[PDB]
């Protein structure tokens, strides 16, 4: 950390971006905690996630979890794109089956 001002500004805007993404992907705070626990092997309670989204955590804990959340959002967005493509594919397949029936 060069200075706490710019770093904490970047972190508090990253927190809003994180909340925005988790909302547009449909995860509850407990869901993010459970998935972080499952793909990194360390449990995270909904409480710590709420505190993170409220910038109510030690700056060291904020920066300690920021990379974890970045990997989590990468995997979540991959899963969302996968599900979206698969749903459209099955819809085209249903069109084929229904018109060909």
């Amino acid at each position: 950390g060069a200075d706490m001002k710019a770093l904490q500004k970047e972190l508090e805007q990253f927190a809003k971006l994180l909340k925005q993404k988790r909302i547009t992907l449909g995860y509850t705070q407990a869901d993010v905690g459970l998935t972080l626990g499952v793909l990194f092997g360390k449990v995270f309670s909904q409480t710590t996630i709420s505190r993170f989204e409220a910038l109510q955590l030690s700056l060291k804990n904020m920066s300690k979890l920021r990379p974890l959340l970045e990997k989590w959002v990468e995997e979540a967005d991959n899963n969302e794109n996968l599900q979206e493509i698969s749903k459209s594919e099955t819809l085209v397949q249903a069109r084929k089956r229904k018109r060909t029936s």
Binding site: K19, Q20, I23, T24, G26
Partner: protein, 77 residues
């Protein structure tokens, strides 16, 4: 004109059902109605709950789209 918090999947399903149940048998208080609604919801399968959960997700997403600066603020007792 105050912003209300978005409703989860249960509230969506219950809001759909209790209107029908009030039209069905009036003079029935929403207390017994809500007891019966929760008892019924507990018995539904995930296949049956899926669309209302997805509707609640869409509702929260649209809520943040409408009110980007919303923050749930209760009043502790």
């Amino acid at each position: 004109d105050r912003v209300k918090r978005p409703m989860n999947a249960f509230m969506v399903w219950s809001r759909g059902q209790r209107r029908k149940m009030a039209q069905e048998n009036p003079k029935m208080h929403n207390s017994e109605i809500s007891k019966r609604l929760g008892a019924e919801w507990k018995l539904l399968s995930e296949t049956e709950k899926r669309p209302f959960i997805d509707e609640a997700k869409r509702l929260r997403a649209l809520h943040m789209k409408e009110h980007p600066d919303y923050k749930y603020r209760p009043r502790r007792k």
